[PDB]
Amino acid sequence: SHSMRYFYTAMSRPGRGEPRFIAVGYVDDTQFVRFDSDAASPRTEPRAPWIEQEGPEYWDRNTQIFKTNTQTYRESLRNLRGYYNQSEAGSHIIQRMYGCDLGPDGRLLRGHDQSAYDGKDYIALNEDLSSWTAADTAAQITQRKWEAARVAEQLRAYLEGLCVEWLRRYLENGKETLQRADPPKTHVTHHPVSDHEATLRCWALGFYPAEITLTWQRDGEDQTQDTELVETRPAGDRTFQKWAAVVVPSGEEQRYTCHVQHEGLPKPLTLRWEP
């Protein structure tokens, strides 16, 4: 279920210069492009080896788009400041996520386009790719303008067309990394915390993509509410790490098993603490 996503950030900074526009693109959990208008001569830069297979026109054209976006989001920030009757002295941020989910037939499974203002939902393209959900009265102004401008029709064409076509292209150009799931390396540790309790921590290291399920079971019963589960974290080499811990009564450790589900595993793993 591959996907392509772009994440846009535009932040106003009155007095400290023009609004800053940042764009990053992802195929699944792999970042492949970056644009930051804060550079002296801003350019789109590669963030994955396979995107460097594109020719010079690709980079020039992406830079043109993102440079234009820098100017367009400056106007959008002014518009929203007017919608909310906000002062010209405060700093505000627009965030946006959009992209396509690839179905098994090589065509669009689901399209996405969501925006936020100051960290709160603002407007979103509905699943039919033909209508919008506005969060508040201000976003209903954007909705009316985008209904008349037919923005949903533009987005639907992109999501069903170029987004799918170029995601399939990237998946091919980098299939030796993008289409190779890396299974986690796994082990279980044991730490006493009292005379009668101990910590069982189940580790998953070096896996890709980030999607994974680590669960503890006691006599085959899920221990979700009792499990400390840290956020999946990046290793720095495009792989990820995660662990799950449970505090158990001393002497029950054999009743506890760790279950690891990941795309790179031939079969789901069942792990125990082995003294």
Binding site: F7, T9, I22, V24, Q31, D36, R47, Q95, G119
Partner: peptide, 17 residues
């Protein structure tokens, strides 16, 4: 440090190494 991005809840995250 890695580039600046955010999660589905709009909160930001960075990796310093």
């Amino acid at each position: 440090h890695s580039d600046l991005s955010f999660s589905k809840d709009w909160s930001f995250y960075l990796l310093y190494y």
